[PDB]
Write a protein that binds this ligand. Structure first.
Ligand code: NA
Ligand code: NA
Length: 153
């Protein structure tokens, strides 16, 4: 069916783009909206309303480019916005070796049911946040299984 194919394409697009960016240590921050509206953070970014593709995600996060400075927010079947703000967690439990992208991913995860993916520009490690929890430096298998569980409904 249609939504099936879209959600699997979304997963593939996330997996391909973060693999590309992780090998090159390109920082990335991708938040996927679910039941909780994120329109109030979409409004802070540059509106794209674009089809989802691994290629567009990669191009967005290229450093020192107009769209890279913040978060991509995916809503339904579109890349809604780029360079968006996400709220920074105040948690002192988040390791000090992790940067602003991780703290923003943790922050949005505390106030929405979104699923947020981080690529670290320091390590290339991929992490995910959900419900105020951080899954740090996930494997490709782990990333795949989590995206399947959380994004295919
Ligand atoms: Na800690
Ligand atoms: Na954890």
């Amino acid at each position: 069916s249609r939504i099936e194919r879209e959600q699997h394409h979304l997963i593939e697009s996330i997996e391909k783009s973060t693999q590309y960016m992780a090998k090159r240590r390109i920082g990335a921050l991708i938040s996927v909206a679910r039941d909780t509206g994120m329109d109030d953070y979409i409004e802070t970014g540059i509106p794209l309303n674009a089809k989802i593709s691994s290629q567009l995600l990669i191009n967005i996060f290229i450093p020192n480019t107009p769209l890279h400075d913040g978060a991509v927010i995916i809503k339904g079947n579109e890349i809604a916005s780029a360079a968006s703000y996400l709220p920074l967690s105040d948690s002192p439990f988040l390791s000090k070796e992790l940067g602003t992208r991780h703290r923003a991913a943790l922050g949005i995860s505390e106030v929405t049911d979104s699923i947020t993916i981080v690529v670290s520009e320091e390590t290339g490690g991929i992490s995910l946040t959900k419900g105020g929890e951080l899954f740090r430096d996930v494997s490709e298998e782990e990333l795949h299984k989590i995206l399947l569980k959380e994004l295919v409904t």
